Structure 1
Amino acid sequence: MARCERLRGAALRDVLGRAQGVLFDCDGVLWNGERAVPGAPELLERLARAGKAALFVSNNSRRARPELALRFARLGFGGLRAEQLFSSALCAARLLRQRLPGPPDGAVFVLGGEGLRAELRAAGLRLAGDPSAGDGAAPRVRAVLVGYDEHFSFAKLREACAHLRDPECLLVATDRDPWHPLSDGSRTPGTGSLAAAVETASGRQALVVGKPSPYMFECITENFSIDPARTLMVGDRLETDILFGHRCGMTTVLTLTGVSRLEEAQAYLAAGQHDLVPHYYVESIADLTEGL
């Protein structure tokens, strides 16, 4: 099982050689804020050359796919197809298209920003507060979606609760990341904090779209035939990316350039909490390139 081994040498050559593809978490892995992890772009270049597939999975609900694609390019990750990029915004839009109840024969009440709303509308979803048809009633709200919402308020929370009074109204969260580190050492609250407030006030459990939910893997694999037994999952958060990998049956690699510390992985290992223990770790993903 996962023993949190430092991946290097012949083992690294073996692990990467056997892998048919690599699934990358983004923040803490490819970059921190506006700074690419040195050697990250070169890894992705060498992977493409090695004939190994690369896919990208982020819990970030801020950007619709077109703006996400621009961000990869800007940070040095060139030549990527938009189809290789998966975010919790995109997959939440897809989950709601697939699951929204109501007769054919709802509207979605969204706590979140314009990039999220853009992604939802692109998937064909009607949003609460979109303008109504003629002067008829507003459509019935059949899901509440909690994403990263820099305009979160008590009034919006109260309104979310009102919608959720109907037990057939879905409650969905893009992700449960509790907070994110910023470049100056400060932190921004994460969607997990807002989801906590909504779940508490409504007495509901949210359906989570993003990592570590297996749903995210369903979203990625709708379009892509990938064998999880031959896929490496690389990420910086034990409770999100490494747990995701284990749930999906992938080999997990913790990179140490982000949120989680080696000491924490080792502590979980000691406590026998194996689903929070990576199979392997690297100081940064630049350490992988040698294995090709």
Structure 2
Amino acid sequence: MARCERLRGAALRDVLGQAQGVLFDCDGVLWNGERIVPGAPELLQRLARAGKNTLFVSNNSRRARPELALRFARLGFAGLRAEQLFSSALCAARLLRQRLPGPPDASGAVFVLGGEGLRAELRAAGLRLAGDPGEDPRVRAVLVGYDEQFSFSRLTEACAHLRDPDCLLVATDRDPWHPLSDGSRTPGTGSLAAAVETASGRQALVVGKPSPYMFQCITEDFSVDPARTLMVGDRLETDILFGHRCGMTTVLTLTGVSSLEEAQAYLTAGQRDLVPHYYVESIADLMEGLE
């Protein structure tokens, strides 16, 4: 039962050694905007060098896997394989492919509330999209992602497709909002999904953290022992909660959304699924336990 203790000294050395792998969130963890967290690339290098598997699990639905790979390299993280990158965009594409395979050749299209990156990810998996060139099939799912073009007319159109009870409703994630470098915030997919759910009378299947589906997506490709895996994230309600549901050890890093006082709040209220096992000021602190 997590005590939100500061990981350092010998415990830090033991916990990492036992680890088969570390799961990292990206935003708030490896970088903030275009500023990387100092030490992070070096940390990743030393991890790989010590044979510890690294995967990246993000709720960000804006970037398709190729463009995510380029961001990593451009920001100084070399030697990443694309196979290591799991976004809500990617796993939503895969979930939708599997729920729509059906025997019927009469595949439909997905109506997407989101950007080019999310669309690209779905096309990469082989899905057809409403609004692409040519005839438009029957819309068979609405996908809600991070959608800067969100509009009343697009909400209305989403709801029309949803009047067909066989049309599925999927959301990339429910993050409510995200911090921007200038100090402001942008609404998250979770706010857009709440609108879509309310106007259509439906509940979405949610793909991203803290939904376990994300772990399912990851385990289709890699063998993961949750008991020997660290989940490292900056956000208690998505990263930590996810980690607990999957049985992983959880590390809150303090370079992002949540504060230690938010964690200690939850601890005192006994909501243990939101209490990290450990915390660090930044992921850089983890290196003292390595060589």
Cα distance, 1:103 vs. partner? Answer: 5.0
**1:130-174 Cα shifts (integer Å, max 9, x gaps):** 22xxxx963111110001111000000001111111111110000
Percent identical among aligned pairs is: 93
Contact 1:178/1:191 (<8 A) preserved: yes
- Equivalent-residue separation in structure 2 for 1:57 and 1:77 (angstroms): 16
Partner SS state of residue 86, structure 1: strand
RMSD between aligned alpha carbons? Answer: 1.2
Residues 175-229 of structure 1: CA deviation (Å, up to 9, x unaligned): 1111111111011111111111101111111111111110011111111111111
**Gapped regions of structure 2 (runs ≥ 5):** none
Task: Confirm or deny: 8 A CA contact 1:174 1:209 kept in the other structure.
Answer: yes
Instruction: Name 1:284's counterpart in structure 2.
Output: 282
Aligned residues: 288
Unaligned stretches of 5+ residues in structure 1: none
Alignment of 1:10-21 (within 5 A): 10-21=10-21
- Equivalent-residue separation in structure 1 for 2:159 and 2:77 (angstroms): 41
Return the alpha-carbon distance in structure 2 between the equivalents of residues 139 and 97 of structure 1. Answer: 15
State how far apart, in whole Å, the 1-side matches of 2:269 and 2:181 are: 32
The ranges of structure 1 where at least 4 consecutive aligned residues each deviate by more than 4 angstroms after the TM superposition are none
Residues in 2 aligned to 1:25 and 1:138: alpha-carbon distance in whole angstroms: 36
- Where 2:174 maps in the other structure, the secondary structure is coil
User: Deviations for 1:224-277, whole angstroms, at most 9, x for unmatched residues?
Assistant: 111111100000010000000001100000000000110011010100000010
TM-score in terms of structure 1 length? 0.96
Separation in 1, partners of 2:219, 2:74: 26
Q: 2 CA distance for matches of 1:79 and 1:101?
A: 34
- For residue 125 of structure 1, what is the aligned residue in structure 2? 127
Aligned equivalents of 2:164 and 2:177: distance in 1? Answer: 30
Shift of 1:10: 0.5
Is the Cα–Cα contact under 8 Å of residues 163 and 169 in structure 1 kept in the other structure?
yes
CA distance in 1, matches of 2:24, 2:278: 14
Aligned partners of 1:2 and 1:280 also within 8 Å: yes
CA distance in 2, matches of 1:102, 1:24: 34
Shift of 1:101: 6.8
Distance 1:103 1:141 in 2: 17
Give, in angstroms, the shift of residue 281 of structure 1.
0.5
Is 1:107 the equivalent of 2:109? yes
